């Protein structure tokens, strides 16, 4: 300042799409001009566009004292009555809340559409029903709820949240999501509700008239996964599941075919069954094709068409709009045994052969669409070490979805960072099982930890200290989850991290869900360390 103003006296008397910081003006070391003392205009004028409540918070709070000193003794009551009228207008206005604090009977269609937008789901078709908000807010029968509670699914995946009401409204489903996001229970649960809610007079049959359900998978591994998950759903409900697959000797599968609801199969083995009469398709009303694009890429298409050719066509839906009307199809699902068939096809891409299978198999379907370094959003801030704590705080102050994880490199860091946050009024755990329960429960919101178990998907990972190698970094950001919401990993980079810049740069440049020239152009990110 003083040396600068002497410098001022001595100086007096003697493509790039961004703008550079050297083009800036008003870099003046004056006490009068940095604090320019903006006006508030009698406590009545407002700066346009900036939020009026925030402007009333950031005011000097001086003219309010001049008001309450110089108003008349009845005018304090007049001001209070005017503020009560304004709060009445605000309460009439707000009666636009968030869905986490609202009920089900008051949740309007705009709120359901924002709820569908929050979990990144979209639906094709007419009159899509309301999804499931929670298990206490769902509409399933209580015994199915008890079985799901015993299985361990605490929170529903969005593919469940959308495909279960559409599955209970007897509609054909095209689910576009990848394997590992919970598609299997998302088609099994309406099947289990339909089977366990039949009357006792409709379940009795003296002969074996085939399955109630055909679940076809292109590979033996996916067939065994859907097999094991269907068994662990079906054993508390007393529902038998038969696997018609390869790799198992023919005597065991043949002996299981003599016993006679759900059959999970592979296409070649299933067509060898159907062309040789080991199992019939009489009472079949439920067809699921998981990964039909993998069936096309391997070439099972005429085989699955010939599997269609064994189906009795007496339960096929008519090709009208009445296949997508929830009233008639809901009452048809309430009819029990004599309903039409329902087909659910899960896929990942759209070739024209899956479109031909959809035009051959489906009658006005509803398309439910869902959607580590390649698939986790990554952001970096270059700074000096001394800047880390204030940048973290600024980030936290923006608000987050708990729980989050903050990683540091040394265990002392872990403890001291954690203290500071609890000082700033944050609920912070350090890092056994006890910690994760609270986080899971909502008690603690921030986990501080070093590179050293098993933990839920997080919305945000912050690398307060950057990892010393890219493999540890990859493992960290992987904590936003295997799939579902991308989540965000924010990394503080300093000059001490230069030996990971090149690989960090690659990690991000290979991430289509990520946007960083500060690193990409940095002199230390240009060559392998």
């Amino acid at each position: 300042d003083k040396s600068k103003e002497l410098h001022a006296i001595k100086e007096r008397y003697l493509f790039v799409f961004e703008w550079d910081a050297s083009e800036d003006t008003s870099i003046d070391y004056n006490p009068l001009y940095k604090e320019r003392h903006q006006v508030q205009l009698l406590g009545r004028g407002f700066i346009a566009g900036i939020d009026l409540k925030q402007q009333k918070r950031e005011q000097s709070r001086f003219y309010g004292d001049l008001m309450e000193k110089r108003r008349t003794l009845e005018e304090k009551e007049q001001e209070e009555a005017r503020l009560r009228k304004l709060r009445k207008k605000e309460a009439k206005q707000r009666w636009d809340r968030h869905w986490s604090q609202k009920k089900l009977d008051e949740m309007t269609d705009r709120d359901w559409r924002i709820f569908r937008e929050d979990y990144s789901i979209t639906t094709k078709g007419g009159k899509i029903p309301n999804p499931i908000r929670s298990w206490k807010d769902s509409s399933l029968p209580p015994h199915i709820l008890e079985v799901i509670d015993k299985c361990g699914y605490k929170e529903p995946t969005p593919i469940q949240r959308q495909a279960i009401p559409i599955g209970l409204q007897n509609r054909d489903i095209i689910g576009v999501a990848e394997t590992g996001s919970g598609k299997t229970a998302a088609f099994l649960i309406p099947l289990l509700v339909w089977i366990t809610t039949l009357p006792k007079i409709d379940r009795i049959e003296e002969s074996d008239q085939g399955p109630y359900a055909i679940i076809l998978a292109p590979t033996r591994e996916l067939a065994q996964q859907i097999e094991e998950e269907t068994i662990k759903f079906g054993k508390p409900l007393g529902i038998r599941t038969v696997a018609v697959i390869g790799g198992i000797s023919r005597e065991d599968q043949g002996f299981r075919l003599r016993m006679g609801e759900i059959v999970i199969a592979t296409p070649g083995r299933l067509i060898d069954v159907l062309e040789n009469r080991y199992l019939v398709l009489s009472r079949c009303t439920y067809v699921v094709l998981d990964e039909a694009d993998r069936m096309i890429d391997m070439g099972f298409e005429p085989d699955v068409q010939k599997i269609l050719e064994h189906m009795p066509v007496s339960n096929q839906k008519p090709d009208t709009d009445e296949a997508e009307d929830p009233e008639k199809m809901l009452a048809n699902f309430e009819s029990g045994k004599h309903k039409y068939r329902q087909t659910v096809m899960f896929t990942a891409t759209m070739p024209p052969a899956v479109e031909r299978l959809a035009r051959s198999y489906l009658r006005r379907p509803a398309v439910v669409y869902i959607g580590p370094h390649e698939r986790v959003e990554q952001k970096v801030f270059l700074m000096s070490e001394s800047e880390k704590r204030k940048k973290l705080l600024a980030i936290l102050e923006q608000g987050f979805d708990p729980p989050i994880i903050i990683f540091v490199n040394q265990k002392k860091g872990c403890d001291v960072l954690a203290k500071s946050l609890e000082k700033m009024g944050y609920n912070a755990c350090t890092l056994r099982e006890f910690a994760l329960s609270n986080l899971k429960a909502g008690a603690k919101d921030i986990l501080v930890a070093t590179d050293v178990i098993d933990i839920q998907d997080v919305s945000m990972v912050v690398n307060y200290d950057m990892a010393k190698n890219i493999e540890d970094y990859i493992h960290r950001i992987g904590r936003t989850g295997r799939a579902g919401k991308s989540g965000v990993a924010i990394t503080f980079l300093t000059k001490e991290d230069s030996a990971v810049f090149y690989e960090l740069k690659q990690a991000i440049l290979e991430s289509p869900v990520s946007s960083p020239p500060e690193l990409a152009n940095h002199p230390d990110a240009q060559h392998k360390p």
Binding site: W19, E23, D24, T25
Partner: protein, 56 residues
């Protein structure tokens, strides 16, 4: 960004000169008297598709 936008505004204010007197200009009135052109009323999206496919 404020300073550069204010720079462009000061340049447009300084370089301003009054426009030269001329005959009043009507391209579409001379297009309308030609028998090769017709007039109608269309939606904005349909003519927006027609313009881009004619450009293609």
């Amino acid at each position: 960004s404020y300073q550069k936008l204010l720079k462009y505004y000061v340049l447009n204010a300084l370089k301003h000169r009054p426009p030269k007197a001329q005959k009043k200009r009507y391209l579409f009135r001379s297009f309308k008297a030609t028998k090769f052109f017709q007039s109608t009323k269309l939606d904005w999206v349909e003519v927006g598709l027609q313009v881009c496919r004619q450009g293609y």
